[PDB]
Design a binder for this molecule. Structure first.
Ligand SMILES: NC(=O)C1=CN([C@@H]2O[C@H](COP(=O)(O)OP(=O)(O)OC[C@H]3O[C@@H](n4cnc5c(N)ncnc54)[C@H](O)[C@@H]3O)[C@@H](O)[C@H]2O)C=CC1
Ligand SMILES: NC(=O)C1=CN([C@@H]2O[C@H](COP(=O)(O)OP(=O)(O)OC[C@H]3O[C@@H](n4cnc5c(N)ncnc54)[C@H](O)[C@@H]3O)[C@@H](O)[C@H]2O)C=CC1
Ligand SMILES: NC(=O)C1=CN([C@@H]2O[C@H](COP(=O)(O)OP(=O)(O)OC[C@H]3O[C@@H](n4cnc5c(N)ncnc54)[C@H](O)[C@@H]3O)[C@@H](O)[C@H]2O)C=CC1
Ligand SMILES: NC(=O)C1=CN([C@@H]2O[C@H](COP(=O)(O)OP(=O)(O)OC[C@H]3O[C@@H](n4cnc5c(N)ncnc54)[C@H](O)[C@@H]3O)[C@@H](O)[C@H]2O)C=CC1
Ligand SMILES: [Mg+2]
Ligand SMILES: [Mg+2]
Lengths: 253, 257, 250, 248
C-alpha cells in the first residue's frame, strides 16, 4: 500500500538529471522515498539539483557523468553503489538535441554527436548498470527514455530519430535477456514537452507542434516522470521489454 | 497535489464502471480502484458473480454496487451506464474488460457461429461500452479516463485463435480513433495488452501446455490479474494525464521477441 | 522468368472486383496471365469487368458475391473451382464505408454494416478459400485489403478503423496457421486513393496527410497486391505491407 | 512491361554487394537490365562480382567501400556518378555480424563495430546518395536493409537490434523528407537467411512459422520491387520478408 515510501531502501540512478524530464524524474523518485543519484554532464547543475532534493528532506547525491565515455558511466554507477550501498533502479535519460536538416544535407559531426549521446550513451549506461543491479542481487528495474521519434519519423531530425529507434531496440533485446533474472527493462516514448527553449519558439512553430498532438497541448516534464516511475515500481512487475507512450495521442494518427 | 493526496484517496469521489468484473482482471481492477478510494460499479454477465464481488468490496469498506450487463446488447450497455450515474451521481473512469474466449481451430476450419460470438462480445461489446460511456463522461463534464482491455493478441497473432486475435486488434483500433476524438475534450482513452494471465482455469490444462505458454514469456512465468489491474489503474489516473491513444503492454516481454 | 505468364495456370478469386482497387488487381492479375474470377455484390459491374478482361485475352468469369453472407462466399469459391478447375490465389478486397461521427454518438447500425462487410467479410472469405486452396493441393497465397487505418486511427471513423485493425489481426493468425502448409497470407495497407470532387481544400486536407504530396492510384495498390501473390514473395507471410506515400511514417 | 528491361538506363549502387543479399540483389537488378555499381569492403570480391555480371551482358563496375568511413562512402557515390553518368537507385545492404553476449557483459568495441557499420553506415550512405539522386533530376529510390530485428528484439544481440532499429528510423525520417521531391525511401526486414551450428539451426527454423529459413534471392526480389516504379506509392515503410517470424 501507498506511494510515499514505495522505494524505501532503494537507490535510483538518473542520467541527465539536472534538467527537464531527468530533474522531474529525480524529484518523483524522491517523493516515493527513493535514494536519488543525480547524474549529469553539468557537474554544478547536478549538485544544485541534489542539494535542492536534500533541502526537501530527500536522500540524494550528485555525480558528474558523461554518457558517451564508458568509464565515466562505470564510475557514476560505482559512485551510486559507493554512496547508497546498491543499485536498484535506473532511468537512462541523458540526451540531445541535434540540428534540423534533411538527411542529404545533414552534418556528419552533428550526426555522431547525436547518436553517441542518445544511443551509445544508453547502451553504456545499461552495460554497467546491469551487473551492479544483478550482483546485488535483489532484482531491479531500468527505464530508457526514448521518444515518439523512437517509433515514428520526423522530417529534419534523422540522427535523433535513428538514435531513439535504437533505444527502443536496445530496450527489447536487453529485456529479453534479463526478464527471467528479475530485471525489468522498458522504454518510454514522450511526445513534445514544454521546456524553456521550446517556449522561445515563435507562435507559428509552437502551434505547429501543438496541432500534431490531438490532446491539443504539449506535455509537461512531470507527466513523463509519472510514467517512468510507475514502470520502475513493483506495481509494473509484469511490464518488461515494452515501450510506453506519453504523447497526447501523437502516434495514434 | 498527487503526493499530498496519496494512495487511499487518489480516486475519492470518482465513479468507476468496470465490465467483466466478477473475476479475473476485472475483479482485480475493481479491487485496485476501491483501494484507491473509487466508487465502484461491478458489471458482469454473471449477475450473481457481480453481486458477490460488490458485497465483498463493501465489507472491505469500499463503496460498490453490482449490475447485470451483456455487452453484446447496446440496450444492456446503456442501462448499465445509467445505473452507474443513477447510483453514484457521475461516471469518470471506465474499464472495458469483458471478453471471451472461443475455440481453437485453424481459419479454414473455424466455426462460423463461434467466430460471431467471439467478435461480438470482444469487439462490438467494447464499441458499445464506449458508445454509451463517453456521453455519460462528457456531459458532466470533468473529463475522465477509459481503459480498453485488449491483449498481446491485439498486436500479434496466434495460430488457432483468429476470431479472438481479430477482435483484439479491433479494440486497439477503437482505442486510437476514439482517443483522437476525445483527448482535447478531457477524456483520455487507452488500451492494455496483457500477456497470458494465470487465470484459475488454465492450471487444469496439461503440464506441457502450460509450460509451452510459459516459455513464450521471457519473464519465465505467466502474469497475475493484480499486475494487469495495476497498469489499468495507472492509465485511468491523473498521473497519466498525457497518456492517450496508446496501447500498453503488460506481458512477459512476450512481444519483445 | 516472364511477367506476362507469371500467373499462367493459376486461378485467382478477387472480391469487390467490379470497381476501384479490386478491379485494378483483376486487370493486373490478367496481364500476368492469371485466370480470374470477378466476384462482386454488383453483379452487372462484375460481368462488365469479366467481359473487358476476356476482350484482353484473359480467361475470366463473373460471379455475384455478398461477402456478408457466409453461404454466398462459399458458393463464390465453389464457382471458382468449378469454372477453372482450382483455386490458387485470392484477394479479399470487398469493403466499405462508414459515415463519420465521434465514437460517443456513432450510429450503432452503421457500425454493424461496416464491421460485417469489412471484417466478417474477410474472415468468411478466408474460411472457404483456404480449404479449397489447401485441397488443390499445391499451395497458394491470399492478400487481404486492409488500410493505413489498420495500424493507425482516424477521428470520426471508429468502426472502420476497428474493422481494418481486425483484418490485420486475422491476417497474422491465419498466416501463422498456414505458413507451413505452403499458403502465404498477407495484408496491404493503402493510404487514401484517388477513387474526387470534394470541397477543394478538404481534398488538399487529405493530400497534406501524405508526405508524398499526392493521393495514391488504384493500380498502384494492385501492383503491391500482385507482387505479394507471386512466387517472388515466397518468403513473405503474416506481414502487413503499406502503400501509403509515407502517411504512417510520421 | 519487360522484366529484362525494367531498369534499363538506370544506375544502381549496392553496398555489401560481394556476398549474400547484396550479391543476389545486384544479380536481380542486372537481370532487370540495370547498370550495377558493386560496392564492398572486399575489393577482390566486389571485382569478381562485377566481372561475373559483365560476362552476363550487364554493365557493372566494382568499387572498394568502407561504410564506417564517411569519406569512403562519398568516394563510392562519386565513383558511380562518374562511371555511369548519374545515380538513380540505391540498396544499403552492407552489414555484419556481431558477437553474442548479454547487454551487461557486451564488449564495448564490438557494440561500436556493429553500430558503426550497420547504423552509421546506412546514414552515411544515404547522406551521400540523396544529393546525387537529387542531382540527376529524375527522382529515384532507396531501399535500406534492416531486419526482423529492426522491430523485435533478440537476446544476446543488443548492438545489432539497436542498429537495425535505427535503420527503420532513418528510413522513416529520410522518406518523410524526400517523398515530395520524388524519392522513395523504404526498408526490408528479412528473417533468418541461409547465408553454423548443430541443431541450433533447427531452433532458428522453429522460430519461423514458414518452417524453413529464407534465401538471399527471396530478399532480393522484395528489394527490387520496392526500387521499381511499380512501388510508386510505397514510401517510408518497413517490409518484412520473414517466415511470419514477427507475426507471433
Ligand atoms: N523535451 C522533449 O520534448 C522530449 C525529450 N525526450 C528525451 O528526454 C530526455 C531529456 O529531455 P529534456 O529533459 O527535455 O532535455 P534537457 O535539456 O532539459 O535535459 C538534458 C540533460 O541531460 C544532460 N546531458 C546532456 N548530455 C549529456 C551527456 N553526454 N552525459 C551526461 N549528461 C548529459 C544535460 O546536462 C541536461 O541537464 C532526452 O533523452 C530527450 O531526448 C524525448 C521525447 C520528448
Ligand atoms: N485471462 C487471460 O489469460 C487474459 C485475458 N485477456 C483479456 O482480459 C479480459 C478479462 O479476462 P479474464 O479476467 O482473464 O477472464 P474471466 O473470464 O475470468 O473474466 C471475464 C469476465 O467477463 C465476463 N463476461 C463474459 N462475457 C460477458 C458479456 N457478454 N457481458 C458482460 N460480461 C461478460 C465474464 O463473466 C467474466 O466474469 C478479457 O478481455 C480477456 O480477453 C487478455 C490477455 C490475458
Ligand atoms: N477508397 C480508398 O481510397 C481506399 C480503400 N481501401 C480499401 O480497398 C477496398 C476496396 O476499396 P475501393 O476500391 O475504393 O472500393 P470501391 O467502392 O471502388 O469498390 C468496392 C467494390 O466492392 C463491392 N462490394 C461492396 N460491398 C460488398 C459486399 N458486402 N460483398 C461483396 N462485394 C462488395 C462493391 O460492389 C464494389 O464493386 C476496401 O476494402 C477499402 O476499405 C483501403 C484504403 C484506401
Ligand atoms: N543473413 C541474415 O540472416 C540477415 C542479414 N541481414 C542483413 O542483410 C545484410 C546482408 O547480410 P548477409 O548477406 O546475410 O551477409 P554477408 O556476409 O554474406 O554480406 C555482407 C557483405 O557486406 C560487406 N561488408 C561488411 N562490412 C563492411 C563495411 N564496413 N563496408 C563495406 N562493406 C562491408 C561484406 O564484405 C560482405 O560482402 C546485412 O546488413 C545484414 O545485417 C538482415 C536480416 C537477415
Ligand atoms: Mg515475437
Ligand atoms: Mg502519424
Amino acid at each position: 500500500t501507498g506511494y510515499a515510501a514505495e522505494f524505501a531502501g532503494r537507490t535510483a540512478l538518473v542520467t541527465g538529471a539536472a534538467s527537464g524530464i531527468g530533474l522531474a524524474t529525480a524529484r518523483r523518485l524522491g517523493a516515493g522515498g527513493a535514494r536519488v543519484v543525480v547524474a549529469d554532464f553539468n557537474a554544478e547543475g547536478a549538485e544544485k539539483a541534489a542539494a535542492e532534493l536534500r533541502a526537501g528532506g530527500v536522500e540524494a547525491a550528485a555525480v558528474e557523468l558523461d554518457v558517451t565515455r564508458p568509464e565515466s558511466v562505470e564510475a557514476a554507477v560505482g559512485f551510486a553503489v559507493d554512496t547508497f550501498g546498491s543499485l536498484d533502479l535506473a532511468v537512462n535519460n541523458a540526451g540531445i538535441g541535434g540540428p534540423s536538416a534533411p538527411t542529404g544535407e545533414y552534418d556528419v559531426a552533428a550526426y555522431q554527436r547525436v547518436v553517441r549521446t542518445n544511443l551509445d550513451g544508453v547502451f553504456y549506461s545499461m552495460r554497467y548498470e546491469l551487473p551492479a543491479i544483478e550482483a546485488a542481487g535483489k532484482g531491479g528495474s531500468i527505464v530508457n527514455v526514448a521518444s515518439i521519434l523512437g517509433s515514428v519519423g520526423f522530417a529534419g531530425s534523422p540522427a535523433y530519430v535513428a538514435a531513439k529507434h535504437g533505444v527502443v531496440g536496445l530496450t527489447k533485446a536487453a529485456a529479453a535477456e534479463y526478464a527471467a533474472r528479475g530485471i525489468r527493462i522498458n522504454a518510454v516514448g514522450p511526445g513534445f514537452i514544454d521546456t524553456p527553449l521550446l517556449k522561445t519558439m515563435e507562435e507559428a512553430a509552437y502551434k505547429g507542434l501543438v496541432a500534431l498532438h490531438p490532446a491539443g497541448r504539449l506535455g509537461r516534464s512531470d507527466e513523463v516522470a509519472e510514467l517512468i516511475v510507475f514502470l520502475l515500481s513493483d506495481r509494473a512487475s509484469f511490464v518488461a521489454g515494452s515501450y510506453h507512450l506519453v504523447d497526447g495521442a501523437y502516434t495514434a494518427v
